[PDB]
Amino acid sequence: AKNVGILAMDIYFPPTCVQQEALEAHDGASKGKYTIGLGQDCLAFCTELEDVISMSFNAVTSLLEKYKIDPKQIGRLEVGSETVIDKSKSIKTFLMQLFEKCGNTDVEGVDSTNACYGGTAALLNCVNWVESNSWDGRYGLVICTDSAVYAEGPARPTGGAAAIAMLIGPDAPIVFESKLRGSHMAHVYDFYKPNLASEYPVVDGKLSQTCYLMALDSCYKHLCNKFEKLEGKEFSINDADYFVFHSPYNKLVQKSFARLLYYDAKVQPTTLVPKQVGNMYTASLYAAFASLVHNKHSDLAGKRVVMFSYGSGSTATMFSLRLCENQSPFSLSNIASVMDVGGKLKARHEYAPEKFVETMKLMEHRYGAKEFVTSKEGILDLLAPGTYYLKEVDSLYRRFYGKK
Template identity: 65%
Template structure:
């Protein structure tokens, strides 16, 4: 609020959404619902979806990452929601959770989490197809979407997820499925429940069948998640930002399928319809302002030992009070807000690194 207050703007409504990796999607839907409601008064909505995904020492640590994505919600946007086709799945699962509030590290059941993810994906896709078919009066299949964007804990799961949807279309005998796919994946449709999630043979066969379409429909949305690792709430939207970055001039009229997942578990599949848009809210201009290439190229490289050292500092300070942070801002981009200190009453104070002043048009 300090940022808004400094501009004299206090007539604001908002809420923090904390819901595992799904929190950003929950906030996004709340914002869209507001703009579509009788309560809307013409103002823009703003979502900031951000997380730091850190893990205790062990095999999960290298998948961690951090990111933030801001989304502006308003009328006549180039990115439009097909809200009526949205399908969700919620159930109770201890696949990934944070029971120790004194630690930022989660308890992770990796195998269960992957199964939960794929199970929720199946459920959401089937629900989406049913809603589409009910409202449109015709069958939906993967051929009716131009791109697919997934919550990305790690890219291998994204590959498995797209392949799973290909298998789903074979299992439901979608009219768009070719004979080759039916021949290769048809024998696996007799597998029951968990059997299909655990079958390595099905996983391998479906990924082989899906590979050509994966390269066209999924690969363009994998750049940032591959480069940054897991970002929790920002993950899906960083992937979507990758798609806009890579294809901004050819997205007019395209449908993008989005799959959001949060452990515990909550998941939603929804779709977006894209148009070129008008300045300043055109897709090419959005891609230009995001400046993803520049941001990736200007990152600072640290050795693993240095990262471990910084993690130890984080562990010591997490939930702590009465400390001052480093005054070294050399690694921060101009305009970045950063924490300066936390006082005895746990109050947090921030400063902003000065912007680079532009003189004489240079």
């Protein structure tokens, strides 16, 4: 099992969105409070028809269909998220629905949690599984999936939603440099969700500030130590071609890279999807990476891409990747083609801020609700053909999905 990493990749985000500038006007906010202060342009959100589960079906289905992967060929499936549907039943069990009507039930892995890190945790687990004595010769599959509902308050411009699927195995175009990494993990009360009934976090801004920079510094310093062992020198900004970050809002990206000290060369091409879609939590780092493949796929072979994953609480890892052109279907070039990031941004559907706010109120009401049917007219029409959607939640909280 050699050159293990990401073989294939896809992204889904809901087509429904609201413009940050329009939102500034609708709110009390002075010009550029979101577009400049946050550095964000557009916000994708889930309507009543979409959730972290349906988004996951879209992403996994698309990957398997487009890279032509046989479902029997998946041996480990793992999900990273902080969007809790059930306190017992993992998002992973839902995803097994896709694997039953071809009889592939022997599939390791479950859900991994810590804030916007769980996707990273799951990815590392799969890479390790491919390299282990237990490996059965099959692909791993990692999903990152998250969605935010803030109907009110200062949090509301900071939401977003997506799902990412990544195929893992040997001889990849996106190879992990196994030892080029640094982690930092601590017990902090910086940004957390201690109110089971509520989606609203408890945020300690000043401590969040200190704890994030401490992690980034420490992760950086530890990667540098391992670089010194690996290649015989200190690691600097010059020792990678690109830096990709957890990107809840673009201003954090700017500060973070600055802290490492170029941005136009090394970081700017990672900003497309995060800036247009919003905070994607566990999927944010990977959407930033997806933007890089989209923008630069023809320049990426031979290059080093450094990746920094954060999650409040806190858990962080900086790690490194070596990219090369390979053979289709698992090539940098085929990955860009399949993701069709440009096609997905054109296919979007904009909401006036008021209709966005109404939809957010609705989402508040449905959160923890049971025994309801979703309302489809005018919304279902906006979803791409084939899209999984929520039809109803029964009186026992069971969720039933449709396709189209």
